[PDB]
A = this chain, B = another copy of it.
Amino acid sequence: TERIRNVALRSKVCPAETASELIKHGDVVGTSGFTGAGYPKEVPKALAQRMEAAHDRGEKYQISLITGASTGPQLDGELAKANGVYFRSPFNTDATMRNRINAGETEYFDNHLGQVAGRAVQGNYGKFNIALVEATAITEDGGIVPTSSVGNSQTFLNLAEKVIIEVNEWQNPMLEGIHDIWDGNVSGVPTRDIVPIVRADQRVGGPVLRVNPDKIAAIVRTNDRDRNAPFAAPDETAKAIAGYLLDFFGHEVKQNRLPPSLLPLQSGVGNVANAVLEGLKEGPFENLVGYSEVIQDGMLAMLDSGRMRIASASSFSLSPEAAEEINNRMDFFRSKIILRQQDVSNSPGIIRRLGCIAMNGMIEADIYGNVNSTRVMGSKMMNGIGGSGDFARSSYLSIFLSPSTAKGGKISAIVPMAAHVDHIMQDAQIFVTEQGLADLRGLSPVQRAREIISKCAHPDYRPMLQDYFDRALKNSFGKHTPHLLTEALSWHQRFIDTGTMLPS
């Protein structure tokens, strides 16, 4: 079945190489792509090849690359390999690009995901020269059907001087209809419109991205794959975490602090998320609803088993097994999933209104419950803040989940002071490790410390943490949030120096 259904636009089909020539040194390029899904593939590869050649000839050739969130080898990977990105935002997970970022070779800023569209419209990244967006199809009326994510694509299409569409035959034609694109003012010039979403399952828009056809400078026919999540399963640590959390949800429901169906759920991806979602798949809470950034393996299973009724997100993050699954029953799943613009999925106004329960991972927390989501030792980027701030601060309950240690026990995930802060105390109420659960609601910082140390810290590190806290209480400048500044970051330095946070 022909994917370009608007006859007139078929005259704009051209090779990826030729399309890449539209992109000039210095350009700001906005692309589709979120959680390894729906990013352009072939034009970035052709661009990277030409960048390498240009550099070899002594010609500067770099772009600014703005996305939905993470992409894949074909985009972040190839461009990073070619040393062709001078600035990157807002969220990366590619190893080559991560290395460029941590070497200072590519400038990076990890904006709150739900804010990126608004900052782009404000001009913070500069004028968008190019929008490069992957599509499942182009409708007879010229609508652009998104692929496996929506992300920021509608905004990039609005802003960009020239538009390049990659129509990817690898993507399932039955994706058409799954997206919900609102034509209102979410991230434009103030005063913005009210987004009339009052339930997580509410569609308020249409199935296509809109663009003036005169702005389309090239369409490239492509055939290449998204990334997939690991198939791998929850270990003992993840299952213990899930166990503590589910017990907690049970007690809240019993105390009438949550409905029997809980509240709209926001979850991450990873061992821990899968375990939590796996836990819920067979849990005592029925008619669950998801209002999240991403559809992962865990949520897909519940939409399947009816334990979750519907899930809202901006993107997919699926294992090959899960992808195969959904691609076989798209007609079914398509009625249980809504893919929204990321400035809507991650809108704090909507998240607070719906009363979302936020469940997110973390690098580390300190004893006062400040959370680092991003920067190892305070300086080395992992992925980025993503939407964890959008959700943590706006949620009805903000929960953070992590193994109590990292790197085979050589790092404590509970530390005297976080080496970098992404989420302040006020934005984190509940902590869960395989050691236990700390409920911090209504507590002062010293009271938070008692709970975090006693409930969440690993036995190998707990006495050291308690020792730090007790001596801090005695010798700190102030006693409201006791610290010993000579020692606060010393565990991190110990790891840098010796490879472990444990004393010799």
Contact = CB atoms under 8 A, between A and B. Distances in A.
A66 to B, nearest CB: 10
A190 B354 contact: yes
A381 interface: yes
A486 B480 contact: no
A50 interface: no
A420 interface: yes
Interface in A442-484: 442-447, 472-473, 476-483
A348 B394 contact: yes
A426 B353 contact: no
Nearest to A368: B420
A485 B485 CA distance: 11
A441 interface: yes
Given A370-B421, A421-B424, A352 B104 contact: no
Instruction: Give chain A's interface secondary structure class.
Output: loop
Contacts of A101: 480
Contacts of A377: 477-478, 483, 485
Nearest to A419: B485
Contact of A112 (B108, B426, B447): B426
- How many copies altogether? 2
A381 B480 CA distance: 6
A473 B192 contact: no
A287 interface: no
Contacts of A480: 101-102, 104, 108, 375, 379-381
Contact of A420 (B199, B422, B481): B481
A119 B190 CA distance: 29
For the complex of A and B, list the 3 residue pairs with the smallest distance between their C-beta atoms, beginning with the closest: A190-B355, A380-B478, A349-B349
13 contacts: A87-B442, A87-B444, A109-B444, A119-B442, A122-B257, A375-B478, A375-B480, A375-B481, A379-B479, A385-B426, A419-B483, A421-B424, A489-B489
